[PDB]
Amino acid sequence: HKTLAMDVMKPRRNDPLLTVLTQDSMTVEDVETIISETTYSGFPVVVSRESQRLVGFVLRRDLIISIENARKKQDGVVSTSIIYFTEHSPPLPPYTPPTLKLRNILDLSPFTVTDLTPMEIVVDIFRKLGLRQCLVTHNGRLLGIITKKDVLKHIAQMANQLFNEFLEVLF
Amino acid sequence: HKTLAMDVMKPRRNDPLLTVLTQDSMTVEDVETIISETTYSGFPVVVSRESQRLVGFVLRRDLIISIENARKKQDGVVSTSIIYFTEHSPPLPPYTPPTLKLRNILDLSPFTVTDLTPMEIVVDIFRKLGLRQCLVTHNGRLLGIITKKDVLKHIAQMANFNEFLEV
Numbered sequence: 646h647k648t649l650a651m652d653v654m655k656p657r658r659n660d661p662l663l664t665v666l667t668q669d670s671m672t673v674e675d676v677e678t679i680i681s682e683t684t685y686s687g688f689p690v691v692v693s694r695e696s697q698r699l700v701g702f703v704l705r706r707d708l709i710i711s712i713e714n715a716r717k718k719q720d721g722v723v724s725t726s727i728i729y730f731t732e733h734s735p736p737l738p739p740y741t742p743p744t745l746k747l748r749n750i751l752d753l754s755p756f757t758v759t760d761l762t763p764m765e766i767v768v769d770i771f772r773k774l775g776l777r778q779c780l781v782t783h784n785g786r787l788l789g790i791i792t793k794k795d796v797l798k799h800i801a802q803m804a805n806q807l808f809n810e811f812l813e814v815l816f
Numbered sequence: 817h818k819t820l821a822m823d824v825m826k827p828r829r830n831d832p833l834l835t836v837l838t839q840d841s842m843t844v845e846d847v848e849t850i851i852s853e854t855t856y857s858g859f860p861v862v863v864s865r866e867s868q869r870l871v872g873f874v875l876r877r878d879l880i881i882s883i884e885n886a887r888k889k890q891d892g893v894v895s896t897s898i899i900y901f902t903e904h905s906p907p908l909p910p911y912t913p914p915t916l917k918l919r920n921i922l923d924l925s926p927f928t929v930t931d932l933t934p935m936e937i938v939v940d941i942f943r944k945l946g947l948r949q950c951l952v953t954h955n956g957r958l959l960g961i962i963t964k965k966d967v968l969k970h971i972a973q974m975a976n977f978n979e980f981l982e983v
């Protein structure tokens with residue numbers, strides 16, 4: 646039984662869904678509680694929760710800075726302001742507060758890998774491209790994530806032990 | 817000003833639509849009239865023309881051998897036989913002919929990149945990973961394709977730009 650990308654990605658079997666953001670429908674408060682409740686380095690950005698179509702990746706570090714920088718300006722941006730990553734602001738009803746565009750802190754080119762891809766190949770892409778993270782997908786829809794550390798844990802489980810597969814690392 | 821993946825991908829502006837196979841709705845005849853009318857090394861396989869969501873990539877040379885052998889097998893495969901790349905056949909009307917499963921020659925892990933990826937990065941990936949080709953997407957839907965030789969024609973165009981000098 647060869648180990649694939651789906652065997653190493655999070656979430657694991659029967660754990661809560663990937664913590665994601667939408668490109669269009671989330672407010673400042675939504676992003677604020679997500680940051681408050683989680684300690685993940687970054688978050689995927691999708692078109693919507695039903696589509697799960699990937700748009701990009703965005704860092705916690707960067708989200709915090711952009712949201713604190715928006716409070717201080719005191720120019721109408723409030724807890725109920727819509728955050729968007731598209732090029733234009735979404736169509737919105739009257740009396741609604743100004744919008745927050747965060748497209749300039751979004752990595753519009755995250756690296757991707759299908760769930761069926763072997764870990765032998767994933768480990769090799771991480772080594773050769775110097776990736777911090779990689780997103781796992783199925784038929785164009787997002788499924789999970791692998792981070793550099795996840796790879797490092799996967800390799801160390803091979804080191805002290807099947808030992809031959811560890812040596813393939815040098816090749 | 818900054819050259820992107822959508823700048824080099826095919827099809828271009830005055831070029832025809834991407835040549836694609838569906839995973840469920842192409843008959844053996846459709847795929848045969850595609851093999852004779854084109855010279856492409858391979859074909860992206862999607863879920864449907866509506867969705868354009870990627871399922872994998874399949875080579876021409878394999879399609880030919882596979883289809884050749886099946887017409888030669890007698891499991892009664894004919895011209896109106898549906899081909900599929902999923903693990904199981906789709907629902908079929910009462911009086912329809914046998915099918916041809918071509919899953920075992922589908923590459924399920926083709927390399928992909930977004931249409932907004934910088935060309936310097938696509939070239940970098942091409943060199944380090946030794947890719948023969950690379951598929952281009954926009955928000956999870958398939959837009960186009962870049963081949964190893966496309967990348968060589970792009971380098972050429974540059975050499976006539978300080979971007980050519982960091983490769």
Ligand SMILES: Nc1ncnc2c1ncn2[C@@H]1O[C@H](COP(=O)(O)OP(=O)(O)O)[C@@H](O)[C@H]1O
Pocket residue numbers: 654655656662663664665684685686687688689790791792793794795
């Ligand atoms: N957004 C996320 N949703 C669910 N799991 C995640 C997410 N981001 C990372 N993970 C997983 O949770 C664990 C910790 O991730 P993180 O703290 O971001 O980096 P690290 O793996 O270096 O500690 C890893 O197994 C990682 O794959």
Ligand SMILES: Nc1ncnc2c1ncn2[C@@H]1O[C@H](COP(=O)(O)OP(=O)(O)O)[C@@H](O)[C@H]1O
Pocket residue numbers: 826827833834835836855856857858859860961962963964965966
């Ligand atoms: N399946 C395809 N559908 C549409 N265009 C393709 C397809 N395959 C390749 N192309 C494009 O048309 C040309 C065909 O190239 P191909 O014969 O596949 O290999 P090469 O580019 O090395 O000659 C290239 O410019 C490529 O970008």
